[PDB]
A and B are shown apart, each in its own frame.
Chain A
Amino acid sequence: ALLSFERKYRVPGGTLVGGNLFDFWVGPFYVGFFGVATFFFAALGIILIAWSAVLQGTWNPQLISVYPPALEYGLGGAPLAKGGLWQIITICATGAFVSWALREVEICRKLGIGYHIPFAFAFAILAYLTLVLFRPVMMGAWGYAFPYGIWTHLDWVSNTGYTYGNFHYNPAHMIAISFFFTNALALALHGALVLSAANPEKGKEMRTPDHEDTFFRDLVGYSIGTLGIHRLGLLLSLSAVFFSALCMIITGTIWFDQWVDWWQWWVKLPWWANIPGGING
């Protein structure tokens, strides 16, 4: 079925691979060569998870868990029941995500729009690959990757964090958190602002972007503007994920001790290092 205004845009073209061969829709969904690729990788992934369920002996989705090769395996392959499936499901996952980004590129080409979305998405994929591929490879084993389970991956988060003390003290992690909170601040403000203009006090006319600038100037002395705010949300959210990837890629590799202790470089700068008093003298 189509949106009222949709037919004019469903023209041939924009595919990256295979010409017209997969240039069609199923309901609302665009297919394309990367739709077929995503489906293949997803499907195989889900079947393999389902088989892992069988070998763990559960079907409960709060219990199903696919764990990577134990550290003894290094960067080699492992048997299906003992780490192998995870390795294959990770390949399938990566294939499905990257296929999803490339399908998005095909949809952009057909619609004549910029590629900002798949580009954005590629940061999420990079965060994922940091955790399951780059970080394991640099650390020397697939076992450092997180297991695929609803709760077990939370276990991995907590265990991984506490290996380095209170993970709060990872400085890249502080920057990452800051971007996440600031992004949520900006999302609230942005939604609220456009809606406050689109939905003014009862009986009144819609307000103008000029009212939106004025509101923020009256409130904080500055307005970033309608273009700026969309640039900002994109930057905050991508910066959040960039610093997330960063804060993990450095951990277990360039830094592996208690993160609290990293901060001593500052306290031991030689001018103030030996001055008595304060907390650290």
Chain B
Amino acid sequence: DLASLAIYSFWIFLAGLIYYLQTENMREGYPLENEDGTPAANQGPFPLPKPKTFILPHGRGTLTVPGPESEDRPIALARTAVSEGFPHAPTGDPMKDGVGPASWVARRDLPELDGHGHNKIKPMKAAAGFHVSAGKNPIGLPVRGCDLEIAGKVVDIWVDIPEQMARFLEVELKDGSTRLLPMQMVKVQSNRVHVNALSSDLFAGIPTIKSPTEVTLLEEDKICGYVAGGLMYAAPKRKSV
């Protein structure tokens, strides 16, 4: 029967496809590791795929995956149990050490470039022809932390040029230096910008950027990590509201 042949073949195909898909999804993070970072004994029934290479634009190299996995940064955490499967306690301040929900990855310390090789994200002040087109303009709004105290003031929006969208608010602190806040972690209100994740005392500790008119992928990760970390780690200072 031709339907029987069709349905039986399709199941063979779907099994092969699921196998292939799972292996493709093991191009990052594998081989699996023990808690000490050595290779685990049981890797599973799926093997690592054969490596592929992405040719990155703008002379930025390739990426070949799978390859040798490494954190490329120290992890300030320690075991809390004598066997596998329990949490690992921060050994210092998890927000400064960048662990837990404050974690960051050691992405390239260069900015993301657009199709034409230009920095993807720029302060709006430096982005020819960019302006706020609808919504409350946050520039000039005081910025409030979850301790209900003012941490600073908004001095610019950092915009994604090719996608025409707000990505960070640039916030000036008491000492006149600035920090970037992810736009996804702020609430623009009629008379302020509210930041639930951080109390005002934590703003100074936001990782700074080394050049004031561009951010690197590495710097984005440190800022975004640190801000998200505050939901857990600034909870004591987080007033009800």
A residues at B contact (CB < 8 Å): 1-14, 20, 23-27, 109-113, 198, 203-211, 213, 225-227
- Can you name 7 A-B residue pairings with CB atoms under 8 Å? A1-B34, A2-B32, A4-B30, A20-B87, A26-B85, A206-B55, A210-B162
Is the pair B42, A11 in contact by a Cβ cutoff of 8 Å? no
- C-alpha gap A14/B100 in the complex (Å): 11
Query: Is B114 close to A, CB under 8 A?
Result: yes
| Count of A-B contacts judged by CB separation below 8 Å | 124
**CB nearest to A226 among chain B residues:** B163
User: Which chain A positions have C-beta within 8 A of B116?
Assistant: 210
- C-alpha gap A23/B56 in the complex (Å): 41
- C-alpha gap A208/B116 in the complex (Å): 9
Is the pair B32, A24 in contact by a Cβ cutoff of 8 Å? no
- C-alpha gap A226/B114 in the complex (Å): 14
Known: A109-B232, A113-B228, A208-B114. A10 touches B29 (CB 8 A): no
- C-alpha gap A207/B80 in the complex (Å): 45
For the residues of B in contact with A, the DSSP-based class is loop
Most buried by A among B30, B57, B102, B229: B57
Is the pair A1, B57 in contact by a Cβ cutoff of 8 Å? no
Of the candidates A3, A14, A26, A204, which one forms a contact with B232 in the assembled complex, judged by CB atoms under 8 Å apart? A14
Is the pair A6, B87 in contact by a Cβ cutoff of 8 Å? no
Query: Is B69 close to A, CB under 8 A?
Result: yes
Is the pair A204, B88 in contact by a Cβ cutoff of 8 Å? no
**CB nearest to B73 among chain A residues:** A8
Known: A11-B94, A213-B162, A227-B165. A206 touches B34 (CB 8 A): no
Say which size band chain B's interface belongs to.
Answer: 35 or more
Is the pair B85, A205 in contact by a Cβ cutoff of 8 Å? no
Known: A208-B115, A209-B163. A10 touches B87 (CB 8 A): yes
User: Which chain A positions have C-beta within 8 A of B40?
Assistant: 1-2
User: Which chain A positions have C-beta within 8 A of B34?
Assistant: 1-2
Is the pair A12, B87 in contact by a Cβ cutoff of 8 Å? yes
Query: Is B178 close to A, CB under 8 A?
Result: no
Query: Is B35 close to A, CB under 8 A?
Result: yes
Query: Is B17 close to A, CB under 8 A?
Result: no
* Distance of B103 from chain A, by nearest CB (Å): 5
Known: A11-B90, A208-B114. A112 touches B228 (CB 8 A): yes
- C-alpha gap A2/B85 in the complex (Å): 10
- C-alpha gap A13/B186 in the complex (Å): 23
**CB nearest to B230 among chain A residues:** A112
| 9 further A-B pairs in the complex, CB-CB below 8 A; given A4-B30, A4-B71, A10-B87 | A1-B34, A1-B40, A2-B35, A5-B71, A7-B33, A8-B103, A11-B90, A23-B87, A213-B162
**CB nearest to B235 among chain A residues:** A13
User: Which chain A positions have C-beta within 8 A of B101?
Assistant: 9, 11, 14, 110-112
Is the pair A112, B232 in contact by a Cβ cutoff of 8 Å? yes
* Distance of A80 from chain B, by nearest CB (Å): 37
- C-alpha gap A210/B161 in the complex (Å): 10
User: Which chain B positions have C-beta within 8 A of A226?
Assistant: 163
Is the pair A208, B103 in contact by a Cβ cutoff of 8 Å? no
User: Which chain B positions have C-beta within 8 A of A213?
Assistant: 162-163
Is the pair B165, A13 in contact by a Cβ cutoff of 8 Å? no
- C-alpha gap A188/B198 in the complex (Å): 39
* Distance of B120 from chain A, by nearest CB (Å): 9
Query: Is B135 close to A, CB under 8 A?
Result: no
- C-alpha gap A79/B229 in the complex (Å): 52
User: Which chain A positions have C-beta within 8 A of B42?
Assistant: 1
Is the pair B231, A24 in contact by a Cβ cutoff of 8 Å? no
Query: Is B86 close to A, CB under 8 A?
Result: yes
* Distance of A261 from chain B, by nearest CB (Å): 37
User: Which chain A positions have C-beta within 8 A of B217?
Assistant: none
Is the pair A205, B29 in contact by a Cβ cutoff of 8 Å? no
